[PDB]
RNA sequence: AAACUUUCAACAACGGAUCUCUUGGUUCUGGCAUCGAUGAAGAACGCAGCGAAAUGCGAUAAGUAAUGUGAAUUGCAGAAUUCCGUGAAUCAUCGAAUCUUUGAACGCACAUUGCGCCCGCCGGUAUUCCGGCGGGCAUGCCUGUUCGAGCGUCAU
RNA sequence: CCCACCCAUACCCCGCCCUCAGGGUAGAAACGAUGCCCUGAGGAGUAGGCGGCCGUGGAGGUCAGUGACGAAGCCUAGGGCGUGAGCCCGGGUCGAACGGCCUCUAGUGCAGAUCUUGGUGGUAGUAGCAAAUACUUCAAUGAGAACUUGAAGGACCGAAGUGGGGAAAGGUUCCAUGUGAACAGCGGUUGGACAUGGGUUAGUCGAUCCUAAGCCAUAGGGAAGUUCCGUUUCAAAGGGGCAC
RNA sequence: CGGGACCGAGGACCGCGCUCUGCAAGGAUGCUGGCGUAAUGGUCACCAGCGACCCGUCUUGAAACACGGACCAAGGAGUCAAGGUUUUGCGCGAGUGUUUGGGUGUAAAACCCGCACGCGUAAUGAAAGUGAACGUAGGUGAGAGCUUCGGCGCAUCAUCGAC
RNA sequence: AGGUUGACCUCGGAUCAGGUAGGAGGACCCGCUGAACUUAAGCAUAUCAAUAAGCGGAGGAAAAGAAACCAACAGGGAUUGCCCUAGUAACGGCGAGUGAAGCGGCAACAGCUCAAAUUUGAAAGCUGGCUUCGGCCCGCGUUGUAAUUUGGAGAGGAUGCUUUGGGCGAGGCUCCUUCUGAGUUCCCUGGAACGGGACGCCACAGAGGGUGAGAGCCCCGUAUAGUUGGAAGCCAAGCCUGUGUAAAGCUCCUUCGACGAGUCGAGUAGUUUGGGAAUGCUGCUCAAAAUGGGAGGUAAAUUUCUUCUAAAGCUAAAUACCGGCCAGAGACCGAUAGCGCACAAGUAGAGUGAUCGAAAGAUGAAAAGCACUUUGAAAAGAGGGUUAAAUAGCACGUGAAAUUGUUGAAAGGGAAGCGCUUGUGACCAGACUUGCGCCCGGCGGAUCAUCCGGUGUUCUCACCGGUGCACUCCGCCGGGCUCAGGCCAG
């Protein structure tokens, strides 16, 4: 149950918010899980996903699919990974659009902004269980 | 006996918003006790009597202690209104009761009072010492100096020997003579002056 | 809104061979020109009787009924029969009405949702948990759009002492669905006799049921309410000797023999 | 007998009811006090590689700066990002700016892209001519300045 | 005058429904006692009055309710229950929710209002598509040519024109190329239609300047005021020259 | 003493009786045959015999006249508030009413508090004003119920008294 | 030089130096102006209504406000608002109707500034300019700018005690920022689990939303304490210092003690009010006073009494809010509803103009929006794929009725439709299929009766373990027999 007065129970302005959310919003919106061993690693449950990083497909038709991500349609809020694709009617490949919730991501793109993301995550969560604990 | 005639339906008040300015009143007074503290949250109020006929058997609390009441109790008039006291100079005190009951008030409120120094280094010997200064207080001058007794008692008892012998007459008669008498004070004094002036004509 | 239907300008064509005389709106150019207009019957019209919000909505009760009322719901949840008509698992509870003690339940003795969970199963409302657990569903009907989106049947109602046995143990219940808590000095009607149906299965700590009977106690204008029956036993009252002494002997039977 | 008209049924039409849905209304409650000559509200005209509108913006024109985030945008085209970075983005914030013609609207006018006046600067042979650019020129009233008028009251 | 016969929802007997009335039913082996058993009478109905039930949207409680192994809705010469409003089931279609019971609540039940909005018939392939004299041949284009083009003919406007240019008004309709549908009350390869581009060059032509009838500022006076009068006034309303 | 038609309500026994091993006496049993499925039954369409004006609406006493209706779907008209009044249910009762407000809260809920106030507890008069027991709160006649069987007598009605 | 040279006063000029107003908004607020429909049978008093429209002016509130008050009491004590007073006092053709206030309870409370005095041993005051920020100048002003005093008083005396100025400041609060628990474990259905089943886990978090169907644990968020970094304010425990040149408070007193004029008031006229004997406002005429003046709800004279102190001014809160901005909600509506507008809606369109003003949402989870072949000039058609489904084809969820086409059946000599009852044809729901009980025979087992112990009960009834040793119980299979069984009939 919610609390505190600024927050909103509206199923109405909740999705009007979830649809007109402006893309950086959407890049928090379209959040995976990391893998156990990933987990393990880093202490992170989940990150923003973003073009580079290597996931596995685990909900859908296309479960156990393996791939890079190749693109992050933030206006479909949809990725598309390698691979994962189907034929038009003419032949051609076009990508199918996966979820990032129905996805595990199984190797980060790591560069420096990225590092000081997950450093800050695993500072905030260890912070938060010895303070509880 | 329904007034509905003129364009009711524009001045139509509905108090759904009862609750809410109750909160709103609970949270300005949270406000204003948490600025004011440790002072109390209110002023002190004198005893007064209400007036007419149908409401002078009980006293309430009244707007400012007088001028008189205040110089009777040592405390100067703009010393009152920075210590908690409210001050009224319209009220004149007419008898001596209310005046007595309310300099005790006063008195009482006095040595009741911890007055903190302007400056803690610097205490002068108008105020309250430090070693003084810790008591547990009030805040809420309307419940610790309110209207105890509001009106008389409606029971005592006396002992068989003390029953007052009563007016001659009964009650009865001398409420008939009093409106008699009051009916009748212009008559008897144009009667008497008549009177006079023959005796004085006819000496 | 009360402008609603009324924003239009539209007057009536008059007695004549072809239309009715409802008002018309004016002008020309849009579909809206010549269509009827400020009519219950007409399509973008005013409701009939428009809706006002100085409706009463609020029903004043007297405070003396409400105090009968509450009483009642509370007599009516020692009863074990009424718990079981009123839908409550209520098989395994050892003791009826349910009375825990305080060293459970105070301080920050369950001020865990796990402790909680652990003592209601222990104590025995842990099928009532299940049934709510297992009785959710969607609504039918517009309360989804509306914001009320699930239902699902009511629990246990813990009964504490806030004086003696703090108020964690509410923290420490707020997230098991179906479970309530309420003060022993603010009992709730609509918790007591949800829906109007008596026979609330109650949780009591020992605090709160040695604490009942000075809140009763201080309810200033109320007492507690002489029944007109001082004995609730109709068979006991009907087959007493002192009754059975006395009647007439019976003039028939339950069934009669027809006579042609 | 068929055709025709009507009745009953199945499928197909016509039409958009019913059901389910809702980034919308409606009502109530709570919080806040902030437009404009330092040019508002409103109006017109423009601005994207590929837009008519809606949206955003003003010749710095679907935007500039700054701060934050940290890899997009996407309908097509074209380019990205040294990804271990002064950094994508139709991103968020927003304290620095730009802000056409107007409008209380202010040189005089305006059914005209009409006609002026003052002061500087630049260019074309240029003391005279031509052109461009910049800053100004409304009214009522207040305080002060300075220049005045009148046997209105006086002194000398 | 006589005999027989025919049939009303009337009368007689019997069954069933409902209403009313009168009885029975606890040391309860005892009951939706708001039930059951026994007996009798009665049955039209407008205005009007009262009672009980059915149905719809929403709310509390409850049914450990139904549901992608198919909710709701819809169709049904398929059935069951109810005097009835209705309720339930089967078959088909369909795709995400919904229902029973007790209370609560209302924007709660349609054949009519020359209603309201939307949709659809017969009339009916009907009434017409008949003012302005009129069209024809060959070739080309094209899927297709009376109403496209070229040539060949025949006619009309007949200089107060069916001609050549302008003012008002319109605003790209102008020109070239291309074109499915729609529009051109037929037809269309054509078009003022649709699509993409292009086109308007001034010291001398107009505007711009002047004043006309007239209109608006200023001074000043009215008016609660929006504002009204006033346009030469009861205004200090400015130009020029000379200077040891 | 024959001939025919329609019906069989009820569901252990109990009763009135008789022609009394039993019965025709407070309501149908016994025996037999075919079939066991569309045969009975039902629904729909049609033919046949008989029956049968087009619905509101208005008018007056009534008809007729008149007015509305091409068809279908969806809306579509005795509602809400205040103040009375009678009746029903409920709480308390010579009192009653927490909610203007305050306290409190799991926060428009629920729970709690009290001064004043409203209505009631007294009326009458224009007003000044005055203000309800002779009596077991009276007598008489009825009156449900109770009774120790002499009476006591509810509510209520009629009548005479008292304040 | 005096026919000059000046000082003032009033009135002007300047694109002089520096400023200010206009318009928008107007829900609420302060005024002005001001109807009629309506209701009174009609209708000029009246009512609607001191309302709508029109005009001027403000703010986050506005306005009101510290008594020329209420009262008549044992007196209350600025203003505002709620409850009550109270549908009361009172007003009212031919009556329809209208209608306050004091007290009382509460919310909130807060008090003050001038004019009338000579600083007169010192205009002690102030705008502007230039500044080296030390001040210096041009001026305003004595026709009065500071100090002092405001009726509660004060001034003058007397008298002896008290009072004060600066600077740090721990700490706390407000607002943005970093960060937060737990399954994508196994099976089945399914195109897709977010469904069913099993095993777990988190919970101060089981609010809400998203994700290919109902997700606490896939994702965003949700709960709670805190925890990174930053800015500006406010409150505040205390701590350092200067001290009395000066200002201030208390107590007493012979005395003094200025207090707002075309105003108050009166008459008259209009309007207004419950104040049509007692109200307010405005216009015209008259026009004050010094224990004076106002009020004391019936006119006047006389004598008293009681209350205040007008004709100058400021001020937070409690109160209002169909405007604006931000936010949270609902027993509200669900695309003919709800705002006119869920959509490029105050749009398209219409009107010279003021203004009037719509219609219109939904493929699918994902465009996977049909490759390729073939017929056609094309639109399209047919095959063949795509999809879970094209019985979803950008005419797109579902797809009712009116009305239409085809197919099948039937009827029809100037209407059809409907009621009762057969018949024919077509199409159907039930019912039935065997049950129970005895007598034999064959199997397969001992939860037959009795007794013993334990346990529970309704305290005399049961359950569990041992004993059965097969003429006793329990099932099954073959025969036989009685009874009861469906439809129509004699």
Same mark, same amino acid.
């Given at each position: 149950?919610?609390?505190?007065?600024?927050?909103? +129970? +509206?199923?109405?302005?909740?999705?009007?918010?979830?649809?007109?959310?402006?893309?950086?919003?959407?890049?928090?919106?379209? +959040?995976?899980?990391?893998?156990?061993?990933?987990?393990?690693?880093?202490?992170?449950?989940?990150?923003?996903?973003?073009?580079? @990083?290597?996931?596995?497909?685990?909900? $859908?038709?296309?479960? @156990?699919?393996?791939?890079?991500?190749?693109?992050?349609?933030?206006?479909?809020?949809?990725?598309?990974?390698?691979?994962?694709?189907?034929?038009?009617?003419? $032949?051609?490949?076009?990508?199918?659009?996966?979820?990032? +919730?129905?996805?595990?991501?199984?190797?980060?793109?790591? @560069?420096? @902004?990225?590092?000081?993301?997950?450093?800050?995550?695993?500072?905030?969560?260890?912070?938060?269980?010895?303070?509880?604990? | 006996?329904?007034?509905?005639?003129?364009?009711?339906?524009?001045?139509?008040?509905?108090?759904?918003?009862?609750?809410?300015?109750?909160?709103?009143?609970?949270?300005?007074?949270?406000?204003?006790?948490?600025?004011? !503290?440790?002072?109390?949250?209110?002023?002190?109020?004198?005893?007064?009597?209400?007036?007419?006929?149908?409401?002078?058997?009980?006293?309430?609390?009244?707007?400012?202690?007088?001028?008189?009441?205040?110089?009777?109790?040592?405390?100067?008039?703009?010393?009152?209104?920075?210590?908690?006291?409210?001050?009224?100079?319209?009220?004149?005190?007419?008898?001596?009761?209310?005046?007595?009951?309310?300099?005790?008030?006063?008195?009482?409120?006095?040595?009741?009072?911890?007055?903190?120094?302007?400056?803690?280094?610097?205490?002068?010997?108008?105020?309250?010492?430090?070693?003084?200064?810790?008591?547990?207080?009030?805040?809420?001058?309307?419940?610790?100096?309110?209207?105890?007794?509001?009106?008389?008692?409606?029971?005592?008892?006396?002992?068989?020997?003390?029953?007052?012998?009563?007016?001659?007459?009964?009650?009865?008669?001398?409420?008939?003579?009093?409106?008699?008498?009051?009916?009748?004070?212009?008559?008897?004094?144009?009667?008497?002056?008549?009177?006079?002036? !023959?005796?004085?004509?006819?000496? | 809104?009360?402008?609603?239907?009324?924003?239009?300008?539209?007057?009536? /064509?008059?007695?004549?061979?072809?239309?009715?005389?409802?008002?018309?709106?004016?002008?020309?150019?849009? =579909?809206?020109?010549?269509?009827?207009?400020?009519?219950?019957?007409?399509?973008?019209?005013?409701?009939?009787?428009?809706?006002?919000? /100085?409706?009463?909505? *609020?029903?004043?009760?007297?405070?003396?009924?409400?105090?009968?009322?509450?009483?009642?719901?509370?007599?009516?949840?020692?009863?074990?029969?009424?718990?079981?008509?009123?839908? *409550?698992?209520?098989?395994?509870?050892?003791?009826?009405? &349910?009375?825990?003690? #305080?060293?459970?339940?105070?301080?920050?003795?369950?001020?865990?949702?796990?402790?909680?969970?652990?003592?209601?199963?222990?104590?025995?409302?842990?099928?009532?948990?299940?049934?709510?657990?297992?009785?959710?569903?969607?609504?039918?009907?517009?309360?989804?759009?509306?914001?009320?989106? =699930?239902?699902?049947?009511?629990?246990? &109602?813990?009964?504490?002492?806030?004086? *003696?046995?703090?108020?964690? &143990?509410?923290?420490?219940?707020?997230?098991?669905?179906?479970?309530?808590?309420?003060?022993?000095?603010?009992?709730?009607?609509?918790?007591?006799?949800?829906?109007? *149906?008596?026979?609330?299965?109650?949780? /009591?700590?020992?605090?709160?049921?040695?604490? &009942?009977?000075?809140?009763?106690?201080?309810?200033?204008?109320?007492?507690?309410?002489?029944?007109?029956?001082?004995?609730?036993?109709?068979?006991?009252?009907?087959? #007493?000797?002192?009754?059975?002494?006395?009647?007439?002997?019976?003039?028939?039977?339950?069934?009669?023999?027809?006579?042609?």
């Amino acid at each position: 149950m919610k609390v505190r007065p600024t927050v909103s +129970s +509206s199923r109405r302005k909740a999705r009007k918010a979830h649809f007109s959310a402006p893309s950086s919003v959407r890049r928090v919106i379209m +959040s995976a899980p990391l893998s156990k061993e990933l987990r393990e690693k880093y202490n992170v449950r989940s990150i923003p996903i973003r073009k580079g @990083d290597e996931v596995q497909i685990v909900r $859908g038709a296309h479960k @156990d699919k393996e791939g890079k991500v190749t693109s992050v349609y933030r206006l479909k809020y949809v990725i598309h990974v390698e691979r994962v694709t189907r034929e038009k009617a003419t $032949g051609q490949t076009v990508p199918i659009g996966i979820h990032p +919730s129905n996805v595990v991501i199984t190797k980060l793109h790591l @560069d420096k @902004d990225r590092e000081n993301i997950l450093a800050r995550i695993k500072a905030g969560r260890e912070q938060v269980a010895k303070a509880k604990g | 006996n329904n007034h509905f005639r003129k364009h009711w339906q524009r001045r139509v008040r509905c108090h759904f918003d009862q609750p809410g300015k109750k909160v709103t009143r609970r949270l300005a007074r949270r406000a204003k006790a948490a600025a004011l !503290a440790p002072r109390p949250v209110d002023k002190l109020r004198p005893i007064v009597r209400c007036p007419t006929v149908k409401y002078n058997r009980r006293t309430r609390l009244g707007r400012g202690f007088t001028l008189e009441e205040l110089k009777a109790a040592g405390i100067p008039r703009l010393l009152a209104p920075t210590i908690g006291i409210a001050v009224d100079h319209r009220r004149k005190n007419l008898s001596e009761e209310s005046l007595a009951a309310n300099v005790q008030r006063l008195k009482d409120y006095k040595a009741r009072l911890i007055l903190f120094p302007r400056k803690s280094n610097k205490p002068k010997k108008a105020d309250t010492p430090k070693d003084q200064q810790t008591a547990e207080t009030t805040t809420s001058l309307r419940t610790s100096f309110g209207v105890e007794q509001p009106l008389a008692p409606g029971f005592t008892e006396i002992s068989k020997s003390e029953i007052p012998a009563g007016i001659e007459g009964g009650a009865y008669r001398a409420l008939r003579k009093a409106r008699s008498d009051a009916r009748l004070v212009g008559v008897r004094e144009k009667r008497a002056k008549e009177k006079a002036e !023959a005796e004085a004509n006819k000496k | 809104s009360e402008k609603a239907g009324h924003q239009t300008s539209a007057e009536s /064509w008059g007695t004549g061979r072809a239309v009715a005389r409802i008002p018309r709106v004016s002008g020309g150019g849009t =579909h809206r020109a010549g269509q009827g207009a400020f009519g219950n019957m007409c399509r973008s019209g005013r409701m009939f009787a428009p809706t006002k919000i /100085w409706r009463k909505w *609020h029903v004043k009760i007297n405070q003396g009924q409400k105090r009968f009322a509450t009483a009642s719901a509370l007599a009516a949840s020692a009863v074990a029969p009424l718990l079981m008509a009123r839908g *409550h698992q209520v098989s395994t509870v050892p003791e009826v009405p &349910l009375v825990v003690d #305080s060293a459970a339940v105070a301080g920050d003795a369950v001020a865990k949702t796990a402790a909680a969970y652990k003592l209601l199963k222990a104590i025995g409302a842990g099928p009532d948990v299940e049934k709510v657990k297992k009785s959710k569903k969607l609504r039918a009907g517009k309360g989804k759009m509306r914001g009320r989106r =699930h239902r699902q049947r009511r629990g246990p &109602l813990i009964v504490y002492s806030p004086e *003696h046995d703090g108020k964690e &143990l509410v923290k420490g219940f707020r997230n098991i669905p179906g479970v309530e808590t309420c003060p022993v000095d603010a009992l709730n009607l609509l918790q007591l006799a949800p829906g109007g *149906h008596l026979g609330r299965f109650i949780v /009591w700590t020992s605090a709160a049921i040695k604490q &009942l009977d000075a809140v009763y106690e201080s309810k200033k204008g109320f007492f507690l309410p002489a029944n007109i029956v001082s004995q609730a036993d109709l068979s006991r009252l009907i087959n #007493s000797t002192e009754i059975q002494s006395v009647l007439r002997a019976p003039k028939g039977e339950a069934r009669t023999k027809r006579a042609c």
